[PDB]
């Protein structure tokens, strides 16, 4: 079993499923790339042995060479390969070596080659005793056909509408028959004339019956596209923090093409394969009525075409994803020379480079020729197939006039029927590459939509809470991003209420995290946060974010109206209290001299008021007063000291000389506090933080 | 006059070379690209005015207001507008204006919504007295047509191909008429058996053919896009350092796929043209011969067919224009939603992001069913036409059977080789949005080929001069980028030769600037540089390329095996050489710990080391040492200060502790040195240098 990887961070997880399933354990891969701690950059190597301890293997790491690999191991086992790549082996036979990569799939290696490309670290694996079998996955193909149920009269209208345009085409094709059995050899003109138009009425029947059936697969497919897209959205929306720091933009983006994947699929194939065999039945059973020998002459038509389709698809494929990688590769080496051009003019080494990209596009050149060679040998063997079984078909035809069994004009109409039988036939047959992508995208798609959302997350909330008026307590809390090195270690404190506050450190101390942890992004692996005698996981979520304002560094402002941006999360403001934001953070004369009117510095200002509009009893600041001007520095200082109605104010500060006049100073250096008082205090208990005063003046 | 922009940065270019082509004077647009001094961020009115006046214009600049425009003035100028993009207005009509932009076209606006969006600036412009003009541009179709000229056996060996495939196609396209005519009628089968075994082998023989001509084509192919994107390439790795800075890297890039739309215009149009005009005069030949009302019917149908395809091939392209607009749109609006999910998060704001992606994506579809409706219709038609006229063929030929003109199994024939004949006009009327979309790419690509390069710029070089160690001179120099503010405004320095000089300034200053002009790299418009008694631009640029080395601020290291990134320019050196460079710097230790022996700190270290193996006259480093620790800080600069065989060492530091024991310092303030000697004298002379000192200790 090889379990073909979704994105290009997922190597391992992808290795790890495979095993699962090996051993009769098939899950979601989005929940196994969770359980590992997977990040943007991979699991190194400690989330495989965690996540399969978890699930109930006996997992444990071991560096091998060459010579370990030939007694012997288990042969389920992840090693590690250079080509954030991992590669599963199998089995050793005879001087050679199985793997399964999540990249290619189930390939062999030489055992030279290997110990070139497979690092020294190896994963070992074994079931333990909590492994029972089981399979904690859905078919995502029903659920996203579940949306069809309320699409079942335009459905309807659409079958409907391919049953009669089926029927007025097979009606009008007796035309060349009705032509020459009785019309040209009996030479009637009147009876031609009348025939001739009544056939040309069926057929604007049929095209406008086809231009119908057409809108309405249309507006079908525009339906159910935008309401898969907009269900995957609403539910990306929902999902927590951990889910948006370990994945890419693209990784999320793409689920939207994909999501057009899935359309092509329920709107294209799930209607075409009730209506092309219908379709078929007909045309066969017409075939039969009208001469045995020729239609079996056309199954076996259909029959050779169906096998060399399928045959020839599939190193279509291979060949395929081989250009595609070698087209990427090219893109990275034509971006790799071009925004490192001033190193390249300043050496004379540019005829260097032209060759060594012309080394790679005559790479790209000899493998985009292996799919136009298998395209060639494919249409070639087609049109064969095609053509000579026209041609028998004709000759078959011809034979059985001159035996009598049919008359003259019925071959033609046979001909006729053998085209309006074979399109539909060979329409589903050249499906398999839709629906394998489709599916494809389909559990794409749909393992993000199992992922727990934060709601639920939550174990409880209070009720009798209507604000978080009340000490801030932190016991002894432990937080690591992911299973990455530790940040939070022993941190304990305790902030008052309407007491302004300052905590500074350098970068990379782990403040803005502490922050995070503070309005309930993440959570404290150990200890507990206490907000009057009540902890954070046991208040609700909302009234979480919506009584805590956050500024950071890297504040943004939306491409909307600014009147949007001042009550991002509140939808019923009046302008009195907009007006004496702006004026009370120094941001209504910036909005006048803008030009129109309410419909980095400016960036930072603007946070700060929408973050104070909040009115918030919880107000932090991490690395922001830092890029104002000391005019506005000393203003927003002054601003934020006079707060009324007991509001908790936190700074997080990088300079100790911007922030002063605060009653109590924390200070953090690596992972936790060494001291602890008011600036006064801290001058004279003697400390690190009297030397970085000391060192910042 | 509304040609298309080719860049997204180009607008104000594209405007300025339609007003020329409209006032009669045709040239390159990447010529005036470069001549306006256009940038990554745009053009601006300044640019536009100098360039206009540089060509003979009596350009201006004038703000307007809306009784302006009511009032008479000249019609053709530019407008500016934000959306900043440069619209040119035509005419103002009653009530009513004409503006032509190159995002769209020539389009249309009224009064309020354009000042609503037009900005107050304006630009007039006029043709000077010397104004003479002329179409300085080339057909660069057949310029890359020529490209053929030295591949013209192949071509020979497909015409001769498309010969022969024609002739068995129309000879076994009578096997329906000899069928019907005699065989059928006559009742015979050794003959039937032996003329349809003649047929199925002519069959077979076209199929052979095909794959022959199938394959030459695709070798064609190959070879010619591998020919012109090598040429591009190797074109673009030879433009001066100005054209890489104010582009974008997708810029350069995407004319790969114009060179692969440029392939498959000249492999594909280029042949089939002929080939189906050969193959349609020969089958409309035979028409005429089997009958002359049905060939003037199949000319009808196809003339049809034409006008159809034409007229909806316009309005396709604008929908389709729109769409793309409409789909770059909601990505950037899911991007920018996506990447900023944590005041989204911590504002209870997830459900009306919800709403405006619906929004979105309603606007989306809606824009896709417009190009639906508009495909539904063009179709319909196309097989109306298609249906009907074959209908009213079969009719006719029925007719003439009856009125004896014909007979029988010719109107077989006559349908065999109708379509024979209707597919390649059908499929060479299809070549439309081809010779469009090629011609356009063409020219986007072949704008640049004929830019001037760096050689050719070069004044004159010198045969005498063979080293570069001497007194370097920078008299009063100019230098601005582009048409920006300048910041070398009046540089005098003196470097005497093999002397450690140390450079300090703030950041911005033009330190980096300096070391690039230095290099050669841009050229000052006023002043001159001066090696020991000689012109920098009287030297050959290789010479000073291969005898100067630079650390930049931000060394970068092209993926591959580090002796090839040590040898970058020399391609002859010795193991013994590459040995003492990684001693030179810090290297040695480094590499041999890496797999195998020798294939930011390391990085940063890895380009010294390079810089040294240079072995140069002069020896720049900005930002070299910065990132090393204390002990690799005073290991290299021990290294470097005892230099032998002359070599003069520039070292650009905004730190002024890290370096002490050069013999002169220079320092950059605002684009003036305001003092220069050595450390002990410098300080004495109480000044800006003491004063940085004192605020940074
Ligand atoms: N998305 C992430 N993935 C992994 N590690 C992270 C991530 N974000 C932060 N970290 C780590 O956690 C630490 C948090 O420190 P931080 O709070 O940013 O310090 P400061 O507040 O002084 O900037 C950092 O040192 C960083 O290495
Ligand atoms: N590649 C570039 N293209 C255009 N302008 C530039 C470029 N690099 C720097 N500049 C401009 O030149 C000025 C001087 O920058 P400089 O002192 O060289 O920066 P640094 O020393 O950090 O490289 C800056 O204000 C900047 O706007
Ligand atoms: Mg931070
Ligand atoms: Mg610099």
């Given at each position: 079993?090889?379990?073909?990887?979704?994105?290009?961070?997922?190597?391992?997880?992808?290795?790890?499923?495979?095993?699962?399933?090996?051993?009769?354990?098939?899950?979601?891969?989005?929940?196994?790339?969770?359980?590992?701690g997977?990040?943007?950059?991979?699991?190194?190597?400690?989330?495989?042995?965690?996540?399969?301890?978890?699930?109930?293997?006996?997992?444990?790491?071991?560096?091998?060479?060459?010579?370990?690999?030939?007694?012997?191991?288990?042969?389920?086992?992840?090693?590690?390969?250079?080509?954030?790549?991992?590669?599963?082996?199998?089995?050793?036979?005879?001087?050679?070596?199985?793997?399964?990569?999540?990249?290619?799939?189930?390939?062999?290696?030489?055992?030279?080659?290997?110990?070139?490309?497979?690092?020294?670290?190896?994963?070992?694996?074994?079931?333990?005793?909590?492994?029972?079998?089981?399979?904690?996955?859905?078919?995502?193909?029903?659920?996203?056909?579940?949306?069809?149920?309320?699409?079942?009269?335009?459905?309807?209208?659409?079958?409907?509408?391919?049953?009669?345009?089926?029927?007025?085409?097979?009606?009008?094709?007796?035309?060349?028959?009705?032509?020459?059995?009785?019309?040209?050899?009996?030479?009637?003109?009147?009876?031609?004339?009348?025939?001739?138009?009544?056939?040309?009425?069926?057929?604007?029947?049929?095209?406008?019956?086809?231009?119908?059936?057409?809108?309405?697969?249309?507006?079908?497919?525009?339906?159910?596209?935008?309401?898969?897209?907009?269900?995957?959205?609403?539910?990306?929306?929902?999902?927590p923090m951990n889910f948006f720091n370990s994945?890419?933009?693209?990784?999320?983006?793409?689920?939207?093409?994909?999501?057009?994947?899935?359309?092509?699929?329920?709107?294209?194939?799930?209607?075409?394969?009730?209506?092309?065999?219908?379709?078929?039945?007909?045309?066969?059973?017409?075939?039969?009525?009208?001469?045995?020998?020729?239609?079996?002459?056309?199954?076996?038509?259909?029959?050779?075409?169906?096998?060399?389709?399928?045959?020839?698809?599939?190193?279509?494929?291979?060949?395929?994803?081989?250009?595609?990688?070698?087209?990427?590769?090219?893109?990275?080496?034509?971006?790799?020379?071009?925004?490192?051009?001033?190193?390249?003019?300043?050496?004379?080494?540019?005829?260097?480079?032209?060759?060594?990209?012309?080394?790679?596009?005559?790479?790209?050149?000899?493998?985009?020729?292996?799919?136009?060679?298998?395209?060639?040998?494919?249409?070639?063997?087609?049109?064969?197939?095609?053509?000579?079984?026209?041609?028998?078909?004709?000759?078959?035809?011809?034979?059985?006039?001159?035996?009598?069994?049919?008359?003259?004009?019925?071959?033609?109409?046979?001909?006729?029927?053998?085209?309006?039988?074979?399109?539909?036939?060979?329409?589903?047959?050249?499906?398999?590459?839709?629906?394998?992508?489709?599916?494809?995208?389909?559990?794409?798609?749909?393992?993000?939509?199992?992922?727990?959302?934060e709601?639920?997350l939550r174990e409880?909330?209070?009720?009798?809470?209507?604000?978080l008026?009340g000490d801030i307590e932190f016991r002894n809390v432990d937080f690591r991003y992911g299973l990455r090195k530790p940040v939070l270690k022993n941190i304990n404190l305790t902030i008052?209420?309407?007491?302004?506050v300052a905590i500074?450190g350098?970068?990379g101390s782990g403040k803005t995290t502490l922050a995070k942890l503070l309005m309930n992004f993440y959570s404290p692996e150990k200890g507990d946060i206490l907000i009057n005698?009540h902890s954070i996981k046991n208040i609700s979520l909302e009234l979480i974010r919506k009584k805590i304002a956050f500024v950071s560094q890297?504040?943004?402002?939306?491409?909307?109206?600014?009147?949007?941006?001042?009550?991002?999360?509140?939808?019923?403001?009046?302008?009195?209290?907009?007006?004496?934001?702006?004026?009370?953070?120094?941001?209504?004369?910036?909005?006048?001299?803008?030009?129109?009117?309410?419909?980095?510095?400016?960036?930072?200002?603007?946070?700060?008021?929408?973050?104070?509009?909040?009115?918030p009893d919880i107000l932090i600041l991490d690395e922001?007063?830092?890029?104002?001007?000391?005019?506005?520095?000393?203003?927003?200082?002054?601003?934020?000291?006079?707060?009324?109605?007991?509001?908790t104010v936190i700074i997080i500060?990088?300079?100790?000389?911007?922030?002063?006049?605060?009653?109590?100073?924390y200070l953090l250096?690596d992972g936790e506090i060494?001291?602890?008082?008011?600036?006064?205090?801290?001058?004279?208990?003697?400390?690190?933080?009297?030397?970085?005063?000391?060192?910042?003046?």
């Amino acid at each position: 079993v090889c379990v073909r990887q979704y994105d290009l961070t997922d190597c391992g997880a992808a290795c790890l499923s495979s095993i699962a399933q090996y051993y009769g354990l098939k899950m979601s891969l989005a929940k196994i790339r969770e359980m590992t701690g997977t990040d943007t950059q991979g699991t190194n190597a400690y989330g495989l042995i965690h996540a399969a301890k978890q699930l109930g293997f006996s997992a444990k790491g071991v560096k091998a060479s060459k010579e370990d690999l030939l007694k012997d191991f288990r042969l389920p086992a992840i090693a590690n390969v250079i080509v954030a790549h991992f590669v599963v082996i199998y089995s050793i036979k005879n001087r050679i070596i199985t793997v399964a990569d999540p990249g290619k799939g189930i390939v062999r290696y030489s055992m030279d080659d290997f110990c070139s490309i497979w690092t020294g670290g190896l994963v070992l694996l074994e079931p333990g005793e909590a492994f029972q079998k089981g399979d904690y996955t859905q078919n995502m193909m029903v659920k996203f056909a579940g949306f069809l149920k309320p699409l079942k009269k335009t459905v309807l209208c659409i079958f409907l509408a391919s049953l009669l345009y089926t029927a007025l085409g097979i009606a009008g094709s007796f035309y060349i028959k009705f032509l020459f059995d009785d019309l040209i050899k009996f030479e009637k003109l009147n009876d031609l004339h009348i025939i001739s138009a009544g056939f040309a009425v069926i057929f604007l029947l049929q095209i406008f019956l086809n231009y119908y059936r057409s809108i309405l697969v249309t507006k079908l497919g525009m339906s159910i596209d935008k309401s898969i897209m907009m269900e995957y959205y609403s539910h990306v929306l929902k999902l927590p923090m951990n889910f948006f720091n370990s994945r890419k933009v693209g990784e999320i983006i793409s689920r939207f093409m994909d999501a057009s994947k899935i359309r092509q699929a329920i709107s294209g194939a799930t209607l075409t394969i009730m209506i092309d065999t219908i379709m078929a039945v007909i045309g066969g059973i017409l075939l039969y009525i009208q001469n045995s020998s020729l239609f079996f002459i056309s199954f076996i038509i259909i029959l050779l075409y169906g096998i060399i389709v399928t045959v020839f698809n599939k190193p279509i494929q291979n060949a395929n994803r081989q250009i595609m990688e070698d087209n990427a590769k090219l893109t990275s080496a034509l971006v790799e020379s071009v925004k490192g051009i001033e190193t390249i003019k300043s050496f004379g080494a540019e005829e260097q480079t032209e060759k060594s990209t012309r080394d790679k596009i005559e790479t790209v050149m000899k493998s985009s020729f292996k799919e136009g060679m298998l395209y060639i040998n494919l249409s070639s063997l087609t049109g064969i197939v095609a053509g000579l079984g026209g041609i028998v078909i004709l000759w078959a035809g011809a034979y059985n006039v001159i035996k009598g069994n049919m008359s003259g004009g019925q071959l033609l109409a046979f001909n006729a029927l053998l085209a309006y039988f074979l399109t539909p036939v060979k329409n589903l047959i050249d499906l398999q590459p839709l629906i394998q992508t489709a599916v494809v995208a389909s559990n794409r798609l749909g393992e993000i939509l199992e992922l727990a959302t934060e709601k639920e997350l939550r174990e409880d909330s209070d009720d009798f809470v209507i604000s978080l008026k009340g000490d801030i307590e932190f016991r002894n809390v432990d937080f690591r991003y992911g299973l990455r090195k530790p940040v939070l270690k022993n941190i304990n404190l305790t902030i008052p209420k309407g007491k302004t506050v300052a905590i500074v450190g350098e970068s990379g101390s782990g403040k803005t995290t502490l922050a995070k942890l503070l309005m309930n992004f993440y959570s404290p692996e150990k200890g507990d946060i206490l907000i009057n005698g009540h902890s954070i996981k046991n208040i609700s979520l909302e009234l979480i974010r919506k009584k805590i304002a956050f500024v950071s560094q890297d504040v943004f402002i939306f491409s909307g109206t600014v009147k949007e941006n001042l009550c991002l999360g509140n939808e019923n403001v009046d302008m009195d209290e907009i007006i004496k934001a702006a004026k009370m953070a120094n941001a209504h004369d910036f909005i006048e001299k803008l030009p129109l009117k309410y419909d980095e510095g400016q960036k930072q200002r603007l946070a700060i008021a929408r973050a104070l509009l909040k009115k918030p009893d919880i107000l932090i600041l991490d690395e922001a007063t830092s890029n104002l001007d000391s005019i506005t520095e000393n203003h927003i200082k002054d601003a934020i000291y006079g707060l009324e109605d007991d509001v908790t104010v936190i700074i997080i500060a990088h300079r100790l000389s911007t922030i002063v006049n605060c009653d109590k100073i924390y200070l953090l250096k690596d992972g936790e506090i060494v001291e602890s008082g008011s600036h006064t205090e801290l001058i004279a208990l003697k400390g690190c933080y009297f030397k970085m005063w000391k060192q910042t003046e």
